[PDB]
Design a protein around this ligand. Structure first.
Ligand SMILES: CCCCCCCCCCC(CCCCCCCCCC)(CO[C@H]1O[C@@H](CO)[C@H](O[C@@H]2O[C@@H](CO)[C@H](O)[C@@H](O)[C@@H]2O)[C@@H](O)[C@@H]1O)CO[C@H]1O[C@@H](CO)[C@H](O[C@@H]2O[C@@H](CO)[C@H](O)[C@@H](O)[C@@H]2O)[C@@H](O)[C@H]1O
Ligand SMILES: CCCCCCCCCCCCCCCCCC(=O)O[C@@H](COC(=O)CCCCCCCCCCCCCCC)COP(=O)(O)OCC[N+](C)(C)C
Ligand SMILES: CCCCCCCCCCCCCCCCCCCC(=O)O[C@H](COC(=O)CCCCCCCCCCCCCC)COP(=O)(O)OCCN
Lengths: 107, 67, 488, 487, 75
C-alpha cells in the first residue's frame, strides 16, 4: 500500500507500508520511511534520517550498521522473488481449457 | 484533472476491449516499427510513417505534440 | 577439363553464393508487394550458411585441391599450410558474421550490402592465402582493401565512420602504392614475378658477397608496405582512429580476418623471396617499437575501442617477434600466437558488441558490472586476463612459446623487451579489472540481455581460453605441420 | 586404491557441482563446500597411510601428455617433502570455509568457489614433478587470491593491496621464466628427474640460480621485498589471511627445496654466505620493527616474516638436521600463524577496530579465548613441547654444523621474539578493563571453540612426539642433501 | 577413466548453461538443447581425439621426411 505518484526515490530508501508519497517528493539517498508516513508535495527527506507519523516528521538519525542493512533486505526480497519466479513457466497451458470449452459448443 | 481523465479513459477503453486478432496485428506493427533508419529508408526513396492504429490521440499527450 | 577445377570449388561456390545473395537482396529489397522488407538478417543468415557450406567443401577436399598443380602453377599454389590457413580464416569469418546479427536489428541497419561485401572480401582473402605470385598477391590484397574501404564508411551519419573510412582509404592506398613500387623493381632486376622462381634466383648468391641495390630496396619497400597493411609501429599513423571510428562489427571483422591472411602472405614472401637476411633487421626494430609503444599507449586510453586497437598493435608486435627468429619454432610460435590472438579478439569484440546494445562508449560505463550481470563480468575478466598473459589461461601459452622461439635464436634482447612490455601490459588490464569489480560508481548503467548466437560463441571461446592448457596438443601439432609444409 | 589424481579432482568436482545450484539455497552451497573440503582432507590423510618412507623414488605418478612430443607433461608425484605440504593445504581449507560460516549469506557462492579453486591449485603445485608446469601453477594463484583480497577486503585501500601483491609477483616471476626457458632449450626437457642428472656449466648455474632466487625472494619475505606481507595481509579477509601466511609463504621455501638445492649444488655453496647475511639481517630488523606496532594484524605478520627467514638459514645449510628442521618449522609455522590470524580475525569480527590499544584486560570476560590465545602465542615462543621448538632448534643445530656466526644471530632473533610475543600478549589480555568503548562483547561460540581443537591437538602432537613426521622424510632429506656430492 | 565422452558431454552441457546464463535466463530454460549440446560436445570431443591421432601420425611422417632430407648434406 505504497501510494507513489510522480515521486523521486534514490537508492537505499526503504519505504514503510501505507506510504502516501505525493508528487515532487525527493527521498534522498539512504533514508527510511516509517509505516503510515505521508509527506506533502515538495518535501524532501535528508540522507541518513528516518521519518514517521502522518506528516513528514523527523524521528531520529541513522547509524552505519542500520544503514547497511537496506541492500541486504533488497537482495533478500530479490531471492524470494527468484524462488517465486520458478513456480510458473512461460506460455501457460490454459489455452487447452479454452480450446476444450470452445469444442464443447460450436467451434 | 476531472476533465482530463475523461479523455484519458478512452484509450484504455479502446485497448482493453481489443480482440485477439486485433492484438496480433497490433503486436506485429509495434515490433515492426520499434526503431527507424533514415539512411536506408531515404536510399530506397521511401518514408516509414507510423500506422494510424499506432497513433495516440493528442488530448492524452503531455500538452500537445502533433509532430 | 572440368575436373581441373576441383581445386577451386571452395572459392567458386562462395562467389556464386555471393552473386545469388546480391541478386536476391536487390530484387526483394525494392518489392512493393512486401513493402520494402528489411532483409539484412535474412541475407546474413544465408551468408553464414554459405560460409559453412564452403567450409565443408574446403575441409573434405584435403586429398584434393592439390590436383592439376602444374596447370594452376602460374596462378596459385595451395598446400597444407594454405589449406589450414584458409580453413581457419573462413571459421573466423563465420564467427564474426554470426556475432553481428543482432547489430542489424537492434539499431535498424538493414543494409544487406554489408554481408555481401564481407563475403566477397573473404573470397579475396582466400585468394591471398593461395596466392603464389606478386600479381595475384597484389590483386588479392586490393580486393579486401577496397571492400574494407567501402564498408568502413557504410554508416553515413556519424562523423567518426566517414572520417575513419577516408583515413583508412588514404593510408591503404599509400601502402598499396609503396608495396607495388617495391614489387616493380624486384621484377625489374630479376624478372621472375613467380615466387617459385624468385626463391631460386636469390638463393644463388648472398647479399653480403655482392650488393644489388635494386633487389634489396625492393624487398625493403615490400616489407614496409606489408607493415603498413598490418599497422605495425612505426607504421601506425591512424590505426586507433580507424578502429574507433569504424562500426563495431566492421572492427570485429578487421584485426582478425585481414591480419591472418596478410600474415600468411608475409610468411610466403619472407620464406621464399627473402634470402639476404635483411628482413630480420626491419622486423626486429619495428616489432620492438610496436611492443613498447602499444604497452605504453594502451595504459593512457579511456575508451574501449582505442584500448582494443592498442592491444591489437601490441599483439601484432608479439607475433612479429616470430619473424626475427627464422626457425621452425619461430614460425610455430608466430602461428600459435595468431590463433590465440584471433580467438581472444573474437571474444573481446563479442563482449563489446554485447554492451553496444546500450551504447557503451568509455571504460567507466562498465562500472559495477559484477552486480547487474556477474557472469558476463567474469567472462570479460577472464578474457582480459588472457590478453594479459596470466598463466592459467590461453594467451599465456602463445607468449610463452614466442619467448621460447626468441631465446632459441639467441635474440636475448627480444626476450627482455617482451618480458618488460608484458609487465607494463598487464598493469592497465588489471586497471580495467578494478573499475569493473571493485569500485562502484554512484550511477549504474543497465544493459539489456544478449542474444543466443553471441552468447554461444562467447561461452565456447571462454571455455577454450580457460581449458586450453589442459589439452594443447592438437594446436601445437597443427602448427608444427604447417611450419614444415612451407618447404615439404 | 586411492591415487594422487582423485585428490586433485575432488575440489574440482566440488566447485563444478557448486556452480550448478543457484544462490537462493545458501545452506546447500555452504554444506556442499564444507563436505567437499572435508572429504578432500580425509583423502589426503588416506594418502599419508599408504606412503612408503623407505624408498627414495617418488610415490604415485600420473602422467598426462601436454606437448605432442611428450617433451613436457603433467608429472604428478609426492615424496617425503611434498606430502606434508599437501596434508597441510588440505587441512587449512575447511578451516577457511568454517571461519566465515556466519557471513556466507553476505559473501555468496563466489567465496567458496574461490577457496576450492585455491585448494585445487595449491594441491597441484606441491605434488608435481614438471619444472615448467610447476611454474605455471606457481603463480597461477594470482587470480583467485587477487579476487579474494579485492572483492572482500579493506574499506577503500583494498585496491592498493591487490596492486602491490600483483606487482611484486610479476618482474621476478618472469625473470624466473627466462631461466625456465634457458633450461628447457639447453637440456631439452623440464622433467625434474632428467634435470637433476644434467651437467650444467659452472658459469651457467650462477645466472640460473640468481633467476630462481629472484622469484623466490618475493614469496619468502626476504630483506628487499617483504613489505607486501604486512600491508596486503592487514588489508585482507580473515580466511584469505590464514592461507596467505599458511601456504603462500611455503612456495618459496618449497621451490628452494625442489628446483634450487638439487640442480645447482655448487652454486648453492658459492651463494651460501649471502643468504646467511640476508636472513640474519631480516630476522634482526623485523624483530626490532615489530615491537613498536599498533596494527592488530602486522604484529604477527612480522613474526611470520621472521620465522620464514629463519627457515632459510637451515634450509640452505646442507644438512640432515638443517633441512629436516626447516620443514618441521615450516609446518609448525603453518599451524601457529594460522591460529594467531584466526584469533585476530575473531577479535576483529566482534569489535571491528584493527588496533591494539583498544583491547585491554578482557581476561575477566573471555577466559576461553584468553587460554587459547595464550597457548598459541606460547607455541610462537618455541617452547619445547610445542611445535616450533623442535624444528627451530633443529635448524639452529644444522646451521651450527656449517657456520658459527650467522645462526648465532638467528638464535639472538628469539631473544627478542619471545620478549615481544609475551609483551604483545600482555597488551590485550592483562590489566584493568576500559568499559568506555567495550560496552558489549561475547566469547567464542561452538564453532570457533571447536575450530581450534585440531590446532591444539596438532600442536601438541608436533611438540611431544615428532618422530612420526621425521620418520617419513629422513630418506628424502638425506637424498636431497647428497645429490651431486660424489666423493 | 574418462573416455572423451564424459568430458565432451559435460563441456557441451556446461557451455549450454553458460550461454543460457549470459542472457539472464534460468539455467535449464530449454533442456532439449541441453541434450543437443551434450551430444554435440561428445561428438566434437571424439572427432578432436581422432583428428589428433591422425595429425600426430602425419606430423611424425613429415618429421621423418625432413630429417632424411637434412641428413643428405653430410652424405
Ligand atoms: C579442452 C579441455 C580438455 C580437458 C580434458 C583433459 C583430461 C585429459 C583426457 C583428454 C582425452 C580426450 C580429450 C578431450 C578434450 C575435450 C574436448 C574439447 C572440445 C569439447 C567439445 C585425451 O587423452 C589421451 O588421448 C590420447 C590420444 O591418442 C593421447 O595419448 C597419446 O596419443 C598419441 C598421439 O598419436 C601419442 O603418440 C601417445 O604418446 C599417446 O598414446 C593423449 O592425448 C592422452 O593420453 C581423454 O582420452 C580419450 O582419448 C582416447 C585415448 O585412448 C580414447 O579413445 C581412443 O580412440 C582410439 C584412437 O583413435 C583408440 O584406438 C582407442 O583405444 C581409444 O578408445 C578415449 O576413450 C579417451 O581415453
Ligand atoms: C607449548 C605448550 C606446552 C604446554 C604448556 C602448558 C602450560 C599451561 C598453559 C595454560 C596456562 C594457563 C594460562 C591461561 C590464560 C591465563 C588467564 C586465563 O584466562 O585463565 C583462565 C583459565 O584459567 C586457567 O589457567 C585454566 C587453563 C589450564 C591451566 C592448567 C594447565 C594444565 C594443563 C597444561 C599442562 C599439562 C601437563 C603437560 C601436558 C603434557 C580463566 O581464569 P579464571 O580464574 O577463571 O579468571 C576468571 C576471569 N575473570 C576474573 C574475568 C572472571
Ligand atoms: C573449444 C572447447 C570448449 C568449447 C566446447 C563447445 C562444445 C560444443 C558446442 C556445444 C554447443 C551447444 C549449444 C546447444 C545447442 C543450441 C542450438 C540452438 C540453435 C538456434 O537456436 O538457432 C538460432 C541460434 O543461433 C545459433 O545458435 C547459431 C549461431 C551460433 C554461432 C556459432 C558460430 C560457429 C562458427 C565460428 C566458430 C568459432 C570460430 C572461432 C575461430 C536461433 O536463435 P533463437 O531461436 O534463440 O532466437 C534468435 C536469436 N538470434
Amino acid at each position: 500500500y505504497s501510494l507513489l505518484r510522480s515521486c523521486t526515490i534514490e537508492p537505499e530508501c526503504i519505504i514503510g507500508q501505507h506510504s502516501i508519497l505525493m508528487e515532487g517528493s525527493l527521498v534522498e539517498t539512504r533514508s527510511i520511511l516509517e509505516a503510515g508516513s505521508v509527506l506533502p508535495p515538495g518535501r524532501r527527506i535528508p540522507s541518513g534520517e528516518l521519518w514517521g507519523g502522518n506528516p513528514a516528521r523527523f524521528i531520529r538519525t541513522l547509524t552505519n550498521e542500520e544503514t547497511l542493512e537496506i541492500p541486504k533486505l533488497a537482495v533478500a526480497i530479490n531471492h524470494l522473488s527468484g524462488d517465486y519466479f520458478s513456480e510458473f513457466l512461460p506460455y501457460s497451458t490454459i489455452y487447452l481449457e479454452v480450446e476444450k470449452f470452445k469444442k464443447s459448443l460450436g467451434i | 484533472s476531472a476533465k482530463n481523465y475523461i479523455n484519458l479513459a478512452q484509450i484504455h477503453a479502446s485497448e482493453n476491449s481489443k480482440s485477439f486478432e486485433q492484438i496480433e496485428v497490433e503486436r506485429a506493427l509495434r515490433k515492426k516499427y520499434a526503431r527507424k533508419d533514415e539512411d536506408y529508408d531515404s536510399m530506397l526513396g521511401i518514408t516509414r510513417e507510423t500506422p494510424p492504429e499506432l497513433i495516440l490521440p493528442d488530448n492524452v499527450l503531455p500538452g500537445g505534440k502533433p509532430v | 577439363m572440368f575436373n581441373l577445377f576441383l581445386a577451386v570449388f571452395p572459392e567458386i561456390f562462395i562467389i556464386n553464393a555471393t552473386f545469388i545473395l546480391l541478386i536476391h537482396g536487390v530484387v526483394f529489397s525494392t518489392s512493393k508487394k512486401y513493402d520494402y522488407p528489411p532483409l539484412a538478417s535474412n541475407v546474413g543468415w544465408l551468408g553464414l550458411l554459405s560460409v559453412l557450406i564452403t567450409l565443408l567443401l574446403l575441409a573434405a577436399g584435403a586429398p584434393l585441391l592439390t590436383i592439376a598443380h602444374l596447370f594452376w602453377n602460374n596462378l596459385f599454389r595451395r598446400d597444407n599450410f594454405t589449406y589450414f590457413c584458409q580453413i581457419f580464416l573462413l571459421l573466423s569469418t563465420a564467427g564474426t558474421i554470426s556475432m553481428c546479427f543482432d547489430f542489424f536489428d537492434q539499431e535498424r541497419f538493414d543494409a544487406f550490402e554489408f554481408i555481401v561485401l564481407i563475403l566477397l572480401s573473404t573470397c579475396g582473402m582466400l585468394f591471398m592465402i593461395s596466392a603464389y605470385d606478386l600479381i595475384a598477391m597484389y590483386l588479392a590484397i586490393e580486393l579486401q582493401s577496397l571492400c574494407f574501404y567501402v564498408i568502413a564508411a557504410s554508416k553515413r551519419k556519424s562523423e567518426f565512420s566517414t572520417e575513419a573510412g577516408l583515413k583508412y582509404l588514404i593510408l591503404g592506398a599509400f601502402s598499396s602504392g609503396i608495396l607495388l613500387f617495391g614489387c616493380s623493381m624486384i621484377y625489374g632486376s630479376t624478372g621472375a614475378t613467380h615466387f617459385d622462381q624468385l626463391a631460386k634466383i636469390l638463393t644463388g648468391y648472398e647479399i653480403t658477397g655482392a650488393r644489388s641495390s635494386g633487389i634489396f630496396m625492393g624487398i625493403l619497400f615490400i616489407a614496409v608496405g606489408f607493415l603498413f597493411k598490418i599497422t605495425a609501429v612505426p607504421f601506425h599513423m591512424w590505426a586507433p582512429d580507424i578502429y574507433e571510428g569504424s562500426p563495431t562489427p566492421v572492427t570485429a571483422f578487421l584485426s582478425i580476418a585481414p591480419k591472418i591472411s596478410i600474415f600468411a602472405n608475409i610468411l610466403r614472401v619472407f620464406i621464399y623471396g627473402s634470402y639476404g637476411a635483411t628482413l630480420q633487421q626491419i622486423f626486429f626494430f619495428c616489432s620492438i617499437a610496436s611492443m613498447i609503444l602499444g604497452a605504453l599507449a594502451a595504459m593512457a586510453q579511456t575508451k574501449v575501442k582505442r584500448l582494443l586497437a592498442y592491444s591489437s598493435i601490441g599483439h601484432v608486435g608479439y607475433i612479429c617477434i616470430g619473424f626475427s627468429c627464422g626457425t621452425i619454432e619461430g614460425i610455430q610460435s608466430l602461428l600459435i600466437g595468431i590463433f590465440i590472438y584471433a580467438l581472444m579478439t573474437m571474444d573481446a569484440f563479442a563482449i563489446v558488441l554485447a554492451l553496444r546494445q546500450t551504447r557503451v562508449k568509455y571504460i567507466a560505463d562498465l562500472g559495477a558490472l559484477a552486480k547487474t550481470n556477474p557472469i558476463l563480468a567474469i567472462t570479460f575478466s577472464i578474457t582480459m586476463f588472457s590478453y594479459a598473459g596470466i598463466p592459467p589461461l590461453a594467451g599465456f601459452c602463445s607468449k610463452f612459446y614466442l619467448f621460447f622461439a626468441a631465446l632459441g635464436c639467441g635474440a636475448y634482447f627480444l626476450a627482455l623487451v617482451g618480458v618488460v612490455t608484458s609487465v607494463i601490459g598487464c598493469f592497465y588490464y588489471i586497471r580495467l579489472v578494478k573499475r569493473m569489480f571493485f569500485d562502484t560508481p554512484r550511477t549504474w548503467i543497465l544493459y539489456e540481455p544478449m542474444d543466443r548466437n553471441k552468447s554461444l560463441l562467447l561461452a565456447m571461446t571462454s571455455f577454450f581460453i580457460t581449458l586450453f592448457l589442459l589439452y594443447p596438443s592438437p594446436l601445437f601439432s597443427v602448427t608444427h605441420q604447417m611450419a614444415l609444409s612451407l618447404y615439404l | 586404491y586411492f591415487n594422487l589424481s582423485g585428490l586433485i579432482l575432488c575440489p574440482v568436482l566440488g566447485s563444478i557441482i557448486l556452480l550448478f545450484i543457484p544462490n537462493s539455497r545458501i545452506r546447500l552451497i555452504r554444506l556442499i563446500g564444507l563436505c567437499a573440503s572435508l572429504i578432500t582432507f580425509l583423502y589426503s590423510l588416506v594418502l599419508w597411510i599408504q606412503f612408503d618412507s623407505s624408498t627414495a623414488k617418488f610415490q604415485f605418478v600420473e602422467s598426462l601428455r601436454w606437448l605432442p612430443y611428450e617433451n613436457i607433461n603433467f608429472y604428478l608425484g609426492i615424496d617425503g617433502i611434498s606430502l606434508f605440504f599437501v596434508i597441510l593445504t588440505t587441512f587449512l581449507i575447511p578451516i577457511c570455509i568454517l571461519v566465515g560460516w556466519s557471513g556466507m549469506r553476505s559473501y555468496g557462492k563466489e567465496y567458496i568457489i574461490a577457496f576450492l579453486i585455491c585448494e585445487f591449485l595449491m594441491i597441484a603445485v606441491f605434488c608435481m614433478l614438471d619444472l615448467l608446469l610447476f611454474y605455471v601453477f606457481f603463480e597461477s594463484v594470482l587470480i583467485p587470491m587477487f579476487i579474494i583480497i579485492g572483492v572482500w577486503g579493506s574499506r577503500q585501500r583494498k585496491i592498493k593491496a591487490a596492486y602491490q601483491f600483483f606487482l611484486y609477483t610479476l618482474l621476478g616471476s618472469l625473470f624466473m621464466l627466462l631461466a625456465i626457458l634457458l633450461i628447457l632449450f639447453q637440456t631439452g626437457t623440464t622433467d625434474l628427474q632428467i634435470l637433476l642428472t644434467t651437467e650444467f656449466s659452472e658459469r651457467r648455474q650462477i645466472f640460473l640460480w640468481i633467476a630462481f632466487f629472484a622469484s623466490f625472494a618475493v614469496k619468502v619475505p626476504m630483506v628487499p621485498v617483504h613489505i607486501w606481507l604486512p600491508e596486503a595481509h592487514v588489508e585482507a579477509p580473515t580466511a584469505g589471511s590464514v592461507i596467505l601466511a599458511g601456504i603462500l609463504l611455503k612456495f618459496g621455501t618449497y621451490g628452494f627445496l625442489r628446483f634450487s638445492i638439487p640442480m645447482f649444488p655448487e652454486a648453492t655453496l658459492c651463494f651460501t654466505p649471502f643468504i646467511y647475511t640476508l636472513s640474519a639481517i631480516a630476522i634482526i630488523y623485523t624483530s626490532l620493527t615489530t615491537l613498536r606496532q599498533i596494527d592488530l594484524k602486522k604484529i604477527i605478520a612480522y613474526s611470520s616474516v621472521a620465522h620464514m627467514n629463519l627457515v632459510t638459514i637451515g634450509m640452505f645449510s646442507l644438512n640432515i638436521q638443517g633441512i629436516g628442521g626447516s620443514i618441521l618449522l615450516m609446518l609448525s609455522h603453518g599451524l601457529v600463524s594460522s591460529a594467531l590470524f584466526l584469533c585476530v580475525g575473531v577479535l576483529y569480527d566482534r569489535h571491528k577496530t584493527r588496533l591494539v590499544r583498544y583491547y585491554g584486560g578482557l581476561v575477566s570476560t573471555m577466559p576461553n579465548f584468553s587460554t587459547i590465545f595464550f597457548f598459541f602465542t606460547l607455541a610462537n615462543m618455541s617452547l619445547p613441547g610445542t611445535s616450533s621448538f623442535i624444528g627451530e632448534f633443529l635448524i639452529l643445530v644444522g646451521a651450527f654444523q656449517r657456520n658459527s656466526l650467522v645462526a648465532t644471530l638467528a638464535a639472538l632473533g628469539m631473544i627478542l621474539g619471545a620478549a615481544y610475543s609475551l609483551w604483545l600478549y600482555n597488551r590485550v589480555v592483562s590489566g584493568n578493563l576500559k568499559p568506555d568503548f567495550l560496552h558489549k562483547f561475547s566469547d567464542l561460540n561452538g564453532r570457533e571453540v571447536f575450530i581450534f581443537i585440531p590446532f591444539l591437538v596438532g600442536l601438541v602432537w608436533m611438540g611431544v612426539y615428532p618422530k612420526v613426521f621425521l620418520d617419513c622424510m629422513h630418506t628424502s632429506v638425506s637424498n636431497l642433501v647428497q645429490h651431486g656430492k660424489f666423493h | 577413466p574418462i573416455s572423451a565422452t564424459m568430458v565432451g558431454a559435460l563441456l557441451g552441457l556446461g557451455t549450454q548453461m553458460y550461454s543460457n546464463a549470459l542472457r539472464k535466463l534460468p539455467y535449464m530454460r530449454h533442456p532439449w538443447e541441453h541434450v543437443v549440446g551434450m551430444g554435440l560436445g561428445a561428438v566434437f570431443a571424439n572427432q578432436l581425439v581422432k583428428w589428433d591421432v591422425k595429425l600426430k601420425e602425419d606430423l611424425d611422417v613429415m618429421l621423418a621426411k625432413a630429417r632424411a632430407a637434412n641428413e643428405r648434406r653430410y652424405f
